[PDB]
Structures are given as C-alpha cells and as structure tokens.
Ligand binder design. Structure first.
Ligand SMILES: O=c1ccn([C@@H]2O[C@H](COP(=O)(O)OP(=O)(O)O)[C@@H](O)[C@H]2O)c(=O)[nH]1
Ligand SMILES: [Mg+2]
Length: 149
C-alpha cells in the first residue's frame, strides 16, 4: 500500500502541537507505520532539502530544521501522498485552506508546521533517507475494512 514521508517541524514541536497534528493525520484514515522523535543531523538536513540548495530560503531552512527536534513519520494509505498534501494544505499557511493543518495552525511559509512528500518519487527517496526498513512496521488495523472497498 502507498506510503508517504511526513515530518512535524521544530515550530510544531516547540509549540506543543505534536498530538494535535498526529490527531488530524490519524482521523483522516492514514495509518502511522513509522514514527520517531529525533534531532536532525546536518548531513541528513542538507541531503533532504538538496533540491532547494541555491535558493534564498536555504541557509535558514537548514538551521531551522536543525534547531529543535522533529517528529519523522511514515504514513500508509490509499493515495497517501496526495491525501496527506490535501490535509496539510498549501505551502503558504495564508493560502492554505481553513481546516488544513497549515491553514489552522501556521502563520508564515517558513514556519509551516509540517512537511509531506510532494510525489511518489520523493516519498520513496525521503522514506529511505530517514528510515531503515526495520523501523517501519506493517500491521492490519480494525478500521482497514471500513476505509476501503
Ligand atoms: O518561499 C518559500 C518557499 C518554501 N519555503 C520553505 O521550504 C519548504 C519547502 O518548500 P516547498 O514549496 O517546496 O514544499 P512544501 O513545504 O509545500 O511541502 C517549505 O515547507 C517552507 O518552509 C520558504 O521558507 N519560503
Ligand atoms: Mg505543499
């Protein structure tokens, strides 16, 4: 089943919103399958945000993502990548739909609560970067039969 990489950013961690954010992910039907609180090493931050390497918001992104712990997640469900993006909302929390995580909780683009892989491609890449296979569990859940056909 489709998987995506989600990460609760240091802003959410320092605002004490880890439970609130997990709740919104869980209640949507997405299954938490990998989850860990971690300090982000430099090596991992730079390679994770490799694609932004030249841009104005770069140096800041790196020191921000390394400034306090994150909660890194692997999440499973039909159409998980796009479903997660939908409940996360637009990059800019001012454009993000009310009721989305960023729409309800965040204020500025640089401090937008949570990251979600933007594609199947980057999901696979991000998952492998942050997690080893043995940290990722598989398990059937009682509600699985009521989420899908
Ligand atoms: O103008 C911008 C665009 C992005 N970002 C930061 O860089 C991250 C990656 O941006 P992107 O639009 O590629 O992905 P998204 O955050 O929407 O998943 C964002 O989460 C922002 O925190 C920023 O600070 N300023
Ligand atoms: Mg986005």
């Amino acid at each position: 089943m489709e998987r995506t990489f989600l990460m609760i950013k240091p802003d959410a961690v320092q605002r004490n919103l880890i439970g609130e954010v997990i709740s919104r992910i869980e209640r949507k039907g997405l299954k938490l399958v990998g989850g860990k609180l971690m300090q982000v090493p430099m090596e991992l931050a730079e390679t994770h945000y490799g694609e932004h390497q030249g841009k104005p918001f770069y140096n800041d992104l790196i020191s921000f993502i390394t400034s306090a712990p994150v909660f890194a997640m692997v999440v499973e469900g039909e159409d998980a990548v796009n479903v997660s993006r939908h409940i996360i909302g637009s990059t800019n929390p001012s454009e993000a739909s009310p009721g989305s995580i960023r729409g309800d909780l965040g204020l500025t683009v640089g401090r937008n609560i949570i990251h979600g892989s933007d594609s199947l491609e980057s999901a696979e890449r991000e998952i492998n970067l942050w997690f080893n296979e043995n940290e990722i569990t598989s398990y059937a859940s009682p509600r699985d039969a009521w989420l899908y056909e």
